[PDB]
């Protein structure tokens, strides 16, 4: 969405996260010149992320468990 190449930028950020143990490195969407979300002041609630993951997983399971449709 920010115009950068998805796979290249994502791979670079992941490699940086692995190399230097900084889980704050993200996608510099606003082109501020740094990847450090801790420095860029990008903050999200832990409850929000946990709910996102939980709800997505449960709904994906519910959809995967359906194998029959009987529309009129």
């Amino acid at each position: 969405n920010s115009g950068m190449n998805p796979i290249q930028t994502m791979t670079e950020v992941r490699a940086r996260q692995v190399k230097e143990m900084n889980p704050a490195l993200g996608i510099d969407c606003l082109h501020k010149g740094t990847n450090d979300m801790k420095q860029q002041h990008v903050i999200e609630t832990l409850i929000g992320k946990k709910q996102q993951i939980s709800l997505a997983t449960q709904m994906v399971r519910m959809i995967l468990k359906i194998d029959d449709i009987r529309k009129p």
């Binding site: 999200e44 929000g48 709910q51 996102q52």
Partner: protein, 77 residues
């Protein structure tokens, strides 16, 4: 406000509404995450894996991810 007829689309709508109700933010992230999960599950099924096993693996990975989220969390005043 989307006028959908497919039942799975209604399920996505309800999932986004649930995320809105419980949290109020991130109602677009849940839908994209669910779509990605199902997209990967498609190629998983094409290789001959029972969808229940796929759901179990997803649940295990979700537990791992949630524990990691608790681990790397930061407290604020």
């Amino acid at each position: 406000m989307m006028d959908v007829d497919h039942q799975i689309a209604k399920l996505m709508v309800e999932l986004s509404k649930s995320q809105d109700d419980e949290i109020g933010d991130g109602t677009t992230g849940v839908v994209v995450l669910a779509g990605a999960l199902l997209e990967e599950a498609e190629q998983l099924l094409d290789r001959g894996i029972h969808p229940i096993r796929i759901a179990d693996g997803y649940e295990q990975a979700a537990r791992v991810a949630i524990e990691h989220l608790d681990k790397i969390s930061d407290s604020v005043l």
